Amino acid sequence: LTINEERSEVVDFSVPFIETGISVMVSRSNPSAFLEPFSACVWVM
Amino acid sequence: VFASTGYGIAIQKDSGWKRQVDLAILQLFGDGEMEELEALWLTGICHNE
Amino acid sequence: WGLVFNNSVPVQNPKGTTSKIMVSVWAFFAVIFLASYTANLAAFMIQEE
Amino acid sequence: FVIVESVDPLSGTCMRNTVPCQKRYIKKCCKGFCIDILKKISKSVKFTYDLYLVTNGKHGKKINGTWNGMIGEVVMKRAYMAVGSLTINEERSEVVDFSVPFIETGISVMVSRSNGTVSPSAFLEPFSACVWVMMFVMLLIVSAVAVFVFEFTIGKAIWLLWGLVFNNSVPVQNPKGTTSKIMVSVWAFFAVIFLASYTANLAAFMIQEEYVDQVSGLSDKKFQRPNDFSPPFRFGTVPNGSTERNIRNNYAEMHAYMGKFNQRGVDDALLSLKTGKLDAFIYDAAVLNYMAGRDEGCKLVTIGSGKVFASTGYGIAIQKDSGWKRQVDLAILQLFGDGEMEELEALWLTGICHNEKNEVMSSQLDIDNMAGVFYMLGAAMALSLITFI
Amino acid sequence: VTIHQEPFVYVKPTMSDGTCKEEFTVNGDPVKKVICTGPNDTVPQCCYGFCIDLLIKLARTMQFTYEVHLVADGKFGTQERVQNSNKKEWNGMMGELLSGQADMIVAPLTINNERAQYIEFSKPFKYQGLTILVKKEIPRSTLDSFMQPFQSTLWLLVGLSVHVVAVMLYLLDRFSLTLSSAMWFSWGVLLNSGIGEGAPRSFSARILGMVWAGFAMIIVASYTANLAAFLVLDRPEERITGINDPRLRNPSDKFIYATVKQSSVDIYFRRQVELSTMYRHMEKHNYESAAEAIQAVRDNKLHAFIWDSAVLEFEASQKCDLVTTGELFFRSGFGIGMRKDSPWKQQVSLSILKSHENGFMEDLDKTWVRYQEC
Amino acid sequence: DSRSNAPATLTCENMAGVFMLVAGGIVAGIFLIFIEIAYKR
């Protein structure tokens, strides 16, 4: 089942066997803390 | 995710088994073998995390 | 500060002996600091989001 | 292997799979692994389960010839079949009928995980010194450019370029040749690479590492000359140990130090290790893997890679030529035939100690392994004095 | 009716005049609230909170006037065999729904199969599952001070190795400024700092320089790996892991891994096969309030509690002192109490459908889920 | 071997191209050495 409101409007429906959602799906894409790790309060010291 | 949802066996409005089969959902998840439902189906080899 | 930053400072160290002791101060100091920036650095490499 | 319990007084009787085992003959509460084994066993086995707590001993022995334990029971035939985890044993065989192993076993002693780890000190070793030799060649070719751009002094100046090469920081008088300076770039970015490279393989060998660094075992003769060390390394089990007598067959010095090796209580001894009261302890081997799994805190690492002495197992033995004998043998057959025995690990054997990589404890103040580098250094001092003379 | 649950709803006691503290959001939203009706712990109070507000949105869609109640007892309902006639009956707020002591209901519970046996409510307003309170152990992992991940024997040994070997090559080139060359020429060898004093010309003693060198660059590396693992690796495993986790499956006094006394999720531990004895020992030490769960949690009292997977989330949102468990179990969700056949029923369901259809869901996420920046 | 862990650390032929690249830089140093010698001349 696509859990759906219009679907509901159609006719009787079930309780979800497996929950679902709404999404799109990326492939795994092929901040640069470089200075950021420095703890620049200490660097100030 | 957007728009939480799910899947089940719907029917024509006011079916005969309606509330019964609803209970079928009840005890159904009542299994806990639904873990094994992930097994026979949902559990993936892509791992995660 | 050349010592401090990657050492490699060309210029004319002063001849004071106690001054040289201070050079030890900043020396082992920025040694620590050095390999430290290394640490947190390749850390942020290794541990990363 | 087995679980003793007391029935809840509020209950007064068992629940779940709890099966009664009395203690004299006031009833006691019964559970545990082999308990479950035989449980599933008698199912299709169709033999109505009846069991209790053993009166004395554990398994049995020859006192004169007498067994103080379950062997004493089937000797007394006080039971139809064997309750309790069999020690697979040849003398045991000589006694009477035996089973096929439900769970395989072995012979071992069990260490705690050594805080004394951290391994061979690859420090220089990662260097790939064939390539480092190619760097010596780089010293040569460096000199080649030296005399080249020309057409002690340049000679020791080479050693300066080697100063660049090694951690830079060379005080001495760079030559003024421009092309020479280009070579300085060569060795410069070069030993930069090399530098951070030694870093690479270095903290690699840190990160990626093989911890190990433990004793081989009674298979090793260091264990066979323990009194020969300053402290002794406690190795063994408690008295009347079945496998202990297997050492009575196996290792002489074992029986020798056995007196010092005297220990009281199994998990107790485990606690002794927790207090470092002993180096390590032999015990029921496969068990030792398991109850090794049982951990107060997660620290110890049982001795041995898992390659164990004297493979063994556990089953339900019996008096020789029993009635069910070959049948119950088949009970073993279909028994392992389950595959739920995986779930036997579950209800029992599967441990929370997890397994496998203990890898990095090696964070250290770095003595020793560092002092090896110190050794290479002093060695350089030696060659130095040699050429000096 | 319901019980005050931060994940469910945040409703403080009422004010002197019953004055509602005026609250915009981090979104500036003048967060709505109603008047609570509840216990003395029989007192009126101040109704507010996320899910409650969702209900407010419900009446907002399907027009019905609002009226509030709270749960007399803590639980929702629990089939219970009494001492009188010993008739097990679902007993709790849902109990009052049988009593219909309010016109509707809402709370944080999935419908048990048991719950269904009594009555039913619509499809889930939200999704969650069974997991347990994970108390974050002290992260710590700071060491080495300056050089401290180097032995006093190590750094010392190396040091007098420097000064000593200095004396060595010094007198070496001496007898045949070495005395002075100790301080600097030895020093900036050690620090490799390059003060620029000078170096002797002895063909071999320079190579001895190279010895002090690899000595150094080595020592550099010593720092390198030092900080490497120092920052690197981690403490041991976090336990948690499976619902079957042997830490739980092995009853002991180590620490108490549990959930709420008289809970709803207790159902998941109530009628069971595998769970039996562990759930028994749990039934021993089980504790009352989920508040009290955060409590003993921070108190390091017990190994673990358990509440809604959602509840877990909002908890971690609340405090960083703890951790998440592994994953969901018995997973369903929660919603607004519904009783048998109801006029409001099917249409109300349709509403909820329009709720997920709407983004006002995610608005609720703002009310709670987004309401935490944790 | 048990080498299935990550032993992989070392560079010999691995970083040879780096070091040898340096070497070719050096021989190049000969060519442009005499070259720039002429240039200065």
PDB file of N, CA and C in Angstrom, chain A residues 1-4 10-23, chain B residues 1-15 18 22 25:
ATOM      1  N   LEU A   1       0.829  -1.186   0.000  1.00  0.00           N
ATOM      2  CA  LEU A   1       0.000   0.000   0.000  1.00  0.00           C
ATOM      3  C   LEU A   1       0.866   1.240   0.000  1.00  0.00           C
ATOM      4  N   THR A   2       0.437   2.230  -0.756  1.00  0.00           N
ATOM      5  CA  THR A   2       0.931   3.579  -0.583  1.00  0.00           C
ATOM      6  C   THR A   2      -0.003   4.232   0.416  1.00  0.00           C
ATOM      7  N   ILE A   3       0.507   4.518   1.608  1.00  0.00           N
ATOM      8  CA  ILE A   3      -0.345   5.160   2.589  1.00  0.00           C
ATOM      9  C   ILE A   3      -0.662   6.545   2.058  1.00  0.00           C
ATOM     10  N   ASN A   4      -1.941   6.822   1.847  1.00  0.00           N
ATOM     11  CA  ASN A   4      -2.287   8.053   1.162  1.00  0.00           C
ATOM     12  C   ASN A   4      -3.658   8.520   1.599  1.00  0.00           C
ATOM     13  N   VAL A  10     -10.657   6.885  -1.189  1.00  0.00           N
ATOM     14  CA  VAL A  10     -11.162   5.826  -2.044  1.00  0.00           C
ATOM     15  C   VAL A  10     -11.976   4.853  -1.207  1.00  0.00           C
ATOM     16  N   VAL A  11     -11.311   4.097  -0.344  1.00  0.00           N
ATOM     17  CA  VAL A  11     -11.985   3.008   0.348  1.00  0.00           C
ATOM     18  C   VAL A  11     -11.168   2.584   1.553  1.00  0.00           C
ATOM     19  N   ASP A  12     -11.539   1.449   2.139  1.00  0.00           N
ATOM     20  CA  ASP A  12     -10.893   0.960   3.348  1.00  0.00           C
ATOM     21  C   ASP A  12      -9.397   0.754   3.138  1.00  0.00           C
ATOM     22  N   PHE A  13      -8.643   0.899   4.224  1.00  0.00           N
ATOM     23  CA  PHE A  13      -7.196   0.780   4.192  1.00  0.00           C
ATOM     24  C   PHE A  13      -6.732   0.008   5.414  1.00  0.00           C
ATOM     25  N   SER A  14      -5.458  -0.366   5.406  1.00  0.00           N
ATOM     26  CA  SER A  14      -4.871  -1.151   6.478  1.00  0.00           C
ATOM     27  C   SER A  14      -4.018  -0.283   7.398  1.00  0.00           C
ATOM     28  N   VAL A  15      -3.455  -0.922   8.417  1.00  0.00           N
ATOM     29  CA  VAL A  15      -2.396  -0.325   9.222  1.00  0.00           C
ATOM     30  C   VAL A  15      -1.084  -0.713   8.561  1.00  0.00           C
ATOM     31  N   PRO A  16      -0.043   0.104   8.667  1.00  0.00           N
ATOM     32  CA  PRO A  16       1.178  -0.190   7.915  1.00  0.00           C
ATOM     33  C   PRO A  16       1.836  -1.460   8.416  1.00  0.00           C
ATOM     34  N   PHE A  17       2.186  -2.331   7.482  1.00  0.00           N
ATOM     35  CA  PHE A  17       3.082  -3.424   7.820  1.00  0.00           C
ATOM     36  C   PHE A  17       4.496  -2.906   8.001  1.00  0.00           C
ATOM     37  N   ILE A  18       4.988  -2.167   7.017  1.00  0.00           N
ATOM     38  CA  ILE A  18       6.282  -1.514   7.090  1.00  0.00           C
ATOM     39  C   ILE A  18       6.049  -0.028   6.912  1.00  0.00           C
ATOM     40  N   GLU A  19       6.572   0.762   7.838  1.00  0.00           N
ATOM     41  CA  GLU A  19       6.414   2.199   7.747  1.00  0.00           C
ATOM     42  C   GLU A  19       7.103   2.715   6.498  1.00  0.00           C
ATOM     43  N   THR A  20       6.681   3.892   6.062  1.00  0.00           N
ATOM     44  CA  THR A  20       7.221   4.467   4.848  1.00  0.00           C
ATOM     45  C   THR A  20       7.260   5.979   5.007  1.00  0.00           C
ATOM     46  N   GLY A  21       7.646   6.653   3.938  1.00  0.00           N
ATOM     47  CA  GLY A  21       7.953   8.062   3.959  1.00  0.00           C
ATOM     48  C   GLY A  21       7.977   8.581   2.546  1.00  0.00           C
ATOM     49  N   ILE A  22       8.580   9.743   2.367  1.00  0.00           N
ATOM     50  CA  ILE A  22       8.664  10.380   1.065  1.00  0.00           C
ATOM     51  C   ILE A  22      10.075  10.892   0.901  1.00  0.00           C
ATOM     52  N   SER A  23      10.745  10.450  -0.156  1.00  0.00           N
ATOM     53  CA  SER A  23      12.134  10.839  -0.310  1.00  0.00           C
ATOM     54  C   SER A  23      12.599  10.650  -1.745  1.00  0.00           C
TER      55      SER A  23
ATOM     56  N   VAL B   1      12.838  11.618   6.672  1.00  0.00           N
ATOM     57  CA  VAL B   1      12.160  11.600   5.389  1.00  0.00           C
ATOM     58  C   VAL B   1      10.953  12.504   5.465  1.00  0.00           C
ATOM     59  N   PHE B   2      10.498  12.916   4.297  1.00  0.00           N
ATOM     60  CA  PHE B   2       9.219  13.575   4.200  1.00  0.00           C
ATOM     61  C   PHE B   2       8.108  12.585   4.512  1.00  0.00           C
ATOM     62  N   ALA B   3       6.935  13.131   4.830  1.00  0.00           N
ATOM     63  CA  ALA B   3       5.657  12.444   4.674  1.00  0.00           C
ATOM     64  C   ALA B   3       5.690  10.980   5.081  1.00  0.00           C
ATOM     65  N   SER B   4       5.746  10.710   6.381  1.00  0.00           N
ATOM     66  CA  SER B   4       5.749   9.333   6.851  1.00  0.00           C
ATOM     67  C   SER B   4       4.554   8.583   6.288  1.00  0.00           C
ATOM     68  N   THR B   5       4.755   7.301   6.023  1.00  0.00           N
ATOM     69  CA  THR B   5       3.736   6.499   5.380  1.00  0.00           C
ATOM     70  C   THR B   5       3.982   5.048   5.748  1.00  0.00           C
ATOM     71  N   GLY B   6       3.318   4.154   5.035  1.00  0.00           N
ATOM     72  CA  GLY B   6       3.536   2.743   5.246  1.00  0.00           C
ATOM     73  C   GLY B   6       2.860   1.937   4.164  1.00  0.00           C
ATOM     74  N   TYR B   7       2.769   0.632   4.411  1.00  0.00           N
ATOM     75  CA  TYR B   7       2.099  -0.273   3.491  1.00  0.00           C
ATOM     76  C   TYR B   7       1.313  -1.317   4.272  1.00  0.00           C
ATOM     77  N   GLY B   8       0.155  -1.678   3.730  1.00  0.00           N
ATOM     78  CA  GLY B   8      -0.720  -2.683   4.290  1.00  0.00           C
ATOM     79  C   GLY B   8      -1.628  -3.223   3.206  1.00  0.00           C
ATOM     80  N   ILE B   9      -2.608  -4.021   3.614  1.00  0.00           N
ATOM     81  CA  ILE B   9      -3.631  -4.498   2.694  1.00  0.00           C
ATOM     82  C   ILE B   9      -4.891  -3.689   2.955  1.00  0.00           C
ATOM     83  N   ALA B  10      -5.183  -2.767   2.057  1.00  0.00           N
ATOM     84  CA  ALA B  10      -6.396  -1.975   2.134  1.00  0.00           C
ATOM     85  C   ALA B  10      -7.561  -2.837   1.667  1.00  0.00           C
ATOM     86  N   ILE B  11      -8.731  -2.227   1.490  1.00  0.00           N
ATOM     87  CA  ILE B  11      -9.861  -2.935   0.895  1.00  0.00           C
ATOM     88  C   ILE B  11     -10.961  -1.962   0.501  1.00  0.00           C
ATOM     89  N   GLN B  12     -12.030  -2.491  -0.087  1.00  0.00           N
ATOM     90  CA  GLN B  12     -13.227  -1.695  -0.283  1.00  0.00           C
ATOM     91  C   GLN B  12     -13.788  -1.291   1.070  1.00  0.00           C
ATOM     92  N   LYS B  13     -14.306  -0.071   1.139  1.00  0.00           N
ATOM     93  CA  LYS B  13     -14.813   0.439   2.400  1.00  0.00           C
ATOM     94  C   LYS B  13     -15.840  -0.521   2.984  1.00  0.00           C
ATOM     95  N   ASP B  14     -15.793  -0.675   4.306  1.00  0.00           N
ATOM     96  CA  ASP B  14     -16.695  -1.552   5.049  1.00  0.00           C
ATOM     97  C   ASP B  14     -16.604  -2.997   4.558  1.00  0.00           C
ATOM     98  N   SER B  15     -15.385  -3.523   4.550  1.00  0.00           N
ATOM     99  CA  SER B  15     -15.258  -4.920   4.187  1.00  0.00           C
ATOM    100  C   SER B  15     -15.683  -5.806   5.352  1.00  0.00           C
ATOM    101  N   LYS B  18     -12.860  -6.647   7.894  1.00  0.00           N
ATOM    102  CA  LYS B  18     -12.117  -5.412   8.111  1.00  0.00           C
ATOM    103  C   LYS B  18     -11.434  -5.332   9.469  1.00  0.00           C
ATOM    104  N   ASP B  22      -7.642  -6.218  10.596  1.00  0.00           N
ATOM    105  CA  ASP B  22      -6.957  -5.227  11.402  1.00  0.00           C
ATOM    106  C   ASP B  22      -6.245  -5.912  12.554  1.00  0.00           C
ATOM    107  N   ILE B  25      -3.237  -7.458  11.593  1.00  0.00           N
ATOM    108  CA  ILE B  25      -2.103  -6.567  11.747  1.00  0.00           C
ATOM    109  C   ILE B  25      -1.636  -6.599  13.185  1.00  0.00           C
TER     110      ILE B  25
END
